Amino acid sequence: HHWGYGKHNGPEHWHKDFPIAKGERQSPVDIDTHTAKYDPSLKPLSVSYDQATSLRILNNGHHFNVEFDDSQDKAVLKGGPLDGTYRLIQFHFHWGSLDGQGSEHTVDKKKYAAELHLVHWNTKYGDFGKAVQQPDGLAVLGIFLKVGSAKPGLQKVVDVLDSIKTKGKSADFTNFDPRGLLPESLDYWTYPGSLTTPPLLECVTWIVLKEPISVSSEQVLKFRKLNFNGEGEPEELMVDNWRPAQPLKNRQIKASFK
């Protein structure tokens, strides 16, 4: 049947339909801070989101996506471990049913309440579809979310969730500025990996920010009211839509800081 996060179609079953689930550069991974290699040659990250143009927000039955107009260099990522310019196409979240779980990557085994993924594709390849055929086709910016004070720049997303409660629904979502989701510091860890949901393609250069952002309990609660199911089907709350840590194998995690 279709993949998901339930006992019968969850992460442990994915390999039957996507053999790459057992590949050599799968994500997410646990970030062991004492084994990460400080690399002084790593350049600072360059996030240029001033001309970003959001279009829609959609519930796809797994998570919700905020999609951006990527027809021009409006919101791009460059610098850091990257060569070339990467265009923002969408961002989504992974969260848990409880505050002690929800993130995909863990730091020294610690799980955060959620994890934000800002997906970008290498412009050298023309479109997203071509990008996913290359080892360096994608760049994902990962931001941990912890429960504390409210993130003002997240409320606009929180407010629209009502209208896209079920699988397949979408709503126009223009003029959203993704800079309001960024932490103060841009220090990060980086390693080569993959998408964390099928097709689990190994085309991603992961950039995980060290500093997490805080969101209120009320903000995260609203994410948990979403539905995995389509309307007219038995209610199945969209929670725990995260994949467990995968073996690091022959990879090294590099830190941009000491």
Nearer to Hg ion, 203 or 238 (CB): 203
Nearer to Hg ion, 137 or 212 (CB): 137
Cα separation, 13 vs 170, in Å, equals 29
Of residues 156-215, those binding Hg ion (CB under 5 A): 201, 203
Q: Which residue is nearest to Hg ion (CB)?
A: 203
Cα separation, 256 vs 48, in Å, equals 19
Task: Flag whether 196 is marked binding.
Answer: yes
Task: Flag whether 1 is marked binding.
Answer: no
Nearer to Zn ion, 117 or 222 (CB): 117
Cα separation, 99 vs 220, in Å, equals 9
**Is 220 a residue that touches Hg ion (CB under 5 A)?**
no
Give min distance, CB of 254 to Hg ion, in A.
20
Task: Give yes or no: 15 in active site.
Answer: no
Question: Of 15, 34, 62, 120, which is the active-site residue?
Answer: 62
Rounded to 5 degrees, what angle do the CA atoms 87, 62, 113 make?
85
Task: Flag whether 92 is marked binding.
Answer: yes
Give min distance, CB of 236 to Hg ion, in A.
31
Residues 6 or more apart whose Cβ sits within 8 Å of residue 214: 145, 146, 147, 148, 149, 150, 151
Rounded to 5 degrees, what angle do the CA atoms 187, 191, 192 make?
145
Among residues 110, 166, 146, 153, the alpha carbon closest in space to that of 220 is found at 146
Nearer to Zn ion, 105 or 151 (CB): 105
Cα separation, 248 vs 39, in Å, equals 19
Give min distance, CB of 242 to Hg ion, in A.
22
Partner whose footprint covers residue 117, from Hg ion, Zn ion, none (CB < 5 to 8 Å by kind):
Zn ion
Partner whose footprint covers residue 203, from Zn ion, Hg ion, none (CB < 5 to 8 Å by kind):
Hg ion
Among residues 189, 139, 192, the alpha carbon closest in space to that of 25 is found at 192
Task: Flag whether 94 is marked binding.
Answer: yes
# residues contacting Hg ion (CB under 5 A): 2
Other residues' Cβ atoms within 10 Å of the Cβ of residue 57? 23
Q: Which residues are catalytic?
A: 62
